[model samples]
Target chain A: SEDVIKQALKRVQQYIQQAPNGYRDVIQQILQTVLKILKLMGMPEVEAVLIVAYVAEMLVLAAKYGYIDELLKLAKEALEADDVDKMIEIFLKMLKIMFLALALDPEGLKKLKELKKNGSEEVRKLIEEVIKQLKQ
Target chain B: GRGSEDVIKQALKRVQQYIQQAPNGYRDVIQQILQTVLKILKLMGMPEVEAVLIVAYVAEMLVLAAKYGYIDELLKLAKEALEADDVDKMIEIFLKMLKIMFLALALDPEGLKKLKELKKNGSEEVRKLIEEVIKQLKQ
Candidate 1:
């Protein structure tokens, strides 16, 4: 457990150094391996929290790079999966990033509009807030 | 074993101290908090949490990985589930992996194909999951 956990931490730190660009290409594999280590450790609470942390980094990178389409894809997937916690989390995170990433994607904005139309009351409210902020 | 509840409470307080009013953008603190929480959960055998939720959490991440175009990890996970003979667990993995198959229909044809190939090598509910996915594809 000690070796595995330490390696995981090292790998995460290495990923951080490679990030904002280099790790973007390998983040998929990164998450794959991280989840494997998470399972191997037999710590579900840690697993869940760490998994979200990795994904949260994914979201952050997508935002920083202006990958709004990718962000929208994740948001739509979370909404479709009916995970309110994740849906809200992703929605809020994207909003936080969007505030900084003012250069929005036209196509992504269209998709976001579509999501607002099709989404649940809670999601629609979140979307509405973002759109309002976008206009104002 | 004595005062396991107290043990939990103490750790819980530590976690709260770390997380409470956490400043935005300091993930290091957040990471430390997660580590602390893990240590606590490990001590009580973690039965306070449900096994189903854990499986579901793992499944959730697997599906997320697959959606982003990395299918191998999820495929490996599904393969292991097939080998384990845990019906409840298999169903959870299968359900999420099946969703991956649907997403793969366009975004990842190769992944979809690999998922179909997994069916050929598996049996029991694994086969059932892949079969249902194939049936859906035919329509």
Candidate 2:
């Protein structure tokens, strides 16, 4: 278990790296780690929600950090590969977490609102779609 | 069976009445009701996720109670929830609270320091998450 913890820390380090196109890879690893931890903790629903939330966070972060082109390319590739369900799931989870987080933390919620205001149209639309799902 | 149903109905009625009439004096009763609900849910074999959702809803209600300046009652209910054997549920509720606190911090950095003590003494997972969040924000 200590080894597991150590490995998890290493993964976290790798996940924070932002250079050399490490972003998507880091996102993937983070998602995997979240899933592993959830399963290990007997939290399947949380795991499922976390994966989606992380991906949504990544997308927003990517846009904020000016990686929109890269993010869009990846999105296109995934779409071409017919990963819509995976995308939808991630977006939905992101919306749920954002809604809850916003309700609890208005200031952090403001960052999200700011993102919607200043980010790309595509990103805004994506977030809006996510929120629409939550409302439904 | 009819008698048991009647008892359940009566209990539910009492709970609803207590919640409606508390008006700043119903903290202990509300907490007892929540504990009873938790026990009943556990007895009914509700799934853990569903149980967590129930607790989360209760926590949301507590936040409203606090906002209304019923600090004593809110604190009592919170303490009762914490005393329960629902570590995961507690964490869920705490995180929800933390999310609100973090948002408040965003509005005024002064409020950010208010949670420093919590971050310093919170559970390992919470401390780690708080540290990471601070680091991320700094970057």
Which candidate gets the maximum DockQ versus the true structure?
2
The estimated TM-scores of all candidates read 0.21, 0.25
**Residue-level lDDT tens digits of model 1 in A1-136:** 3332343345566655665453353454444444554444444444434444544544555556756444555444443433333444455555445423422445444443432333232233333333443453
Evaluate residue A34 in candidate 2 and report its C-alpha lDDT on the 0 to 100 scale. 47
**What is each candidate's fraction of native interface contacts (fnat)?**
0.00, 0.00
Model 1 chain B is weakest, by summed lDDT over 10 consecutive residues, at B120-129
- How does model 1 score on DockQ? 0.02
Candidate 1 CAPRI assessment class: incorrect
Q: Write candidate 1's Cα lDDT for B3-98 as tens digits.
A: 324334544454455444344443354444345335443442434322223334443443445457555544454444444343345444545565
Q: In model 2, which runs have C-alpha deviations exceeding 4 angstroms?
A: A1-20, A50-55, A58-136, B1-139
- Candidate 1, superposed: residue stretches over 4 Å from native: A1-3, A21-45, A49-69, A72-136, B1-139
Stretch of 10 with least lDDT, candidate 2 chain A: A115-124
Can you list each candidate's DockQ?
0.02, 0.03
Provide the global lDDT of candidate 1 against the true structure.
0.43
